[PDB]
Design a protein around this ligand. Structure first.
Ligand SMILES: Nc1ncnc2c1ncn2[C@@H]1O[C@H](COP(=O)(O)OP(=O)(O)CP(=O)(O)O)[C@@H](O)[C@H]1O
Ligand SMILES: NCC1(O)CN(C(=O)c2ccc(F)c(F)c2Nc2ccc(I)cc2F)C1
Ligand SMILES: [Mg+2]
Length: 282
């Protein structure tokens, strides 16, 4: 195989890229091959049987080949930590982008939407993987203006081991999934919807309120909306279609791929690489 034997000593740290909900991310050098990578270290306390079942499940990522999906190099265990090794995105994520930008403009978000719709389609049609955690920190970008999905639930055991340590981004869960309902394809679309609204307006799109209240609000109250004067009705409509509370009525990826917002967006000439670089100092 291309790399075959990944181990801690090969890798040399260039920078920490930061920490999330159970992992820390480094920009590495892979000394032997000359590859620049992102290496996510997820600390767990697990049997060596389950630690090897996770690593074997992860190897399915070798098969994920898409310009809309962050590329995988390998997965290994060393000194208390599972390593996921992946293509390095020099734009970081949209959540980082949003913190620097304040608000991400609708035209860039039409381009975000397309890549996401296409990433999710690929994962589902090729590999039968739902993402399970769509949110701006898991949408990555680079100086070539590429936009890619990371952190999707490839390994059912890493899912399992992840869940029964941490609660996660319950703020991103669909009403149905908060009511207990098992994960659905229709849940990734809800979260795509909410992600776009949040990047559009510059902040998590619900009234502020203690966490437990939020969860009941989501199931009980109606879904978020864009403000109607400062966004196109195309973008408005697109967003509302992803955020129907009934999963039977929510739009699917197919229907979303042909929406007027997307048709419009695709034909636009947006220099997102240029924007990103003036924006974040690349
Ligand atoms: N392939 C990659 N290239 C560059 N930066 C990356 C990267 N993957 C992750 N990062 C950055 O590292 C940081 C940590 O990622 P991580 O997935 O740990 O947390 P997060 O910020 O997405 C919350 P969560 O843990 O729920 O996903 C994030 O800022 C992310 O943007
Ligand atoms: N906060 C919860 C999360 O958002 C779920 N996270 C993961 O890192 C993750 C979880 C399950 C899984 F199978 C992975 F492969 C995961 N990682 C993963 C999946 C695909 C790629 I490419 C790169 C990756 F690191 C963080
Ligand atoms: Mg993440």
């Amino acid at each position: 195989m291309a790399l075959g034997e990944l181990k801690d000593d090969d890798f040399e740290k260039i920078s920490e890229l930061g920490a999330g909900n159970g992992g820390v991310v480094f920009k590495v050098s892979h000394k032997p091959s000359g590859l620049v990578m992102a290496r996510k270290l997820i600390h767990l306390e697990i049997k060596p049987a389950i630690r090897n079942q996770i690593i074997r499940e992860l190897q399915v990522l070798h098969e994920c080949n898409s310009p809309y999906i962050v590329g995988f190099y390998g997965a290994f265990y060393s000194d208390g930590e599972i390593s996921i090794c992946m293509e390095h995105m020099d734009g970081g994520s949209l959540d980082q982008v949003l913190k620097k930008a304040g608000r991400i403009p609708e035209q860039i978000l039409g381009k975000v939407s397309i890549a996401v719709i296409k990433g999710l389609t690929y994962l589902r049609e090729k590999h039968k993987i739902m993402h399970r955690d769509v949110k701006p920190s898991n949408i990555l970008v680079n100086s070539r203006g590429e936009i890619k999905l990371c952190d999707f639930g490839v390994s059912g055991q890493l899912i399992d081991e992840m869940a029964n340590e941490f609660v996660g981004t319950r703020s991103y869960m669909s009403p149905e999934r908060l009511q207990g309902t098992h994960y659905s394809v229709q849940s990734d679309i809800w979260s795509m919807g909410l992600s776009l609204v949040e990047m559009a307006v510059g902040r998590y799109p619900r009234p502020p309120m203690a966490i437990f209240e939020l969860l009941d609000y989501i199931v009980n109250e109606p879904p978020p909306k864009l403000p109607s004067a400062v966004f196109s009705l195309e973008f408005q409509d697109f967003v509302n279609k992803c955020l129907i509370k009934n999963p039977a009525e929510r739009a699917d990826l197919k229907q979303l791929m042909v929406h007027a917002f997307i048709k419009r967006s695709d034909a636009e000439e947006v220099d997102f690489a240029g924007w990103l670089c003036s924006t974040i100092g690349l």
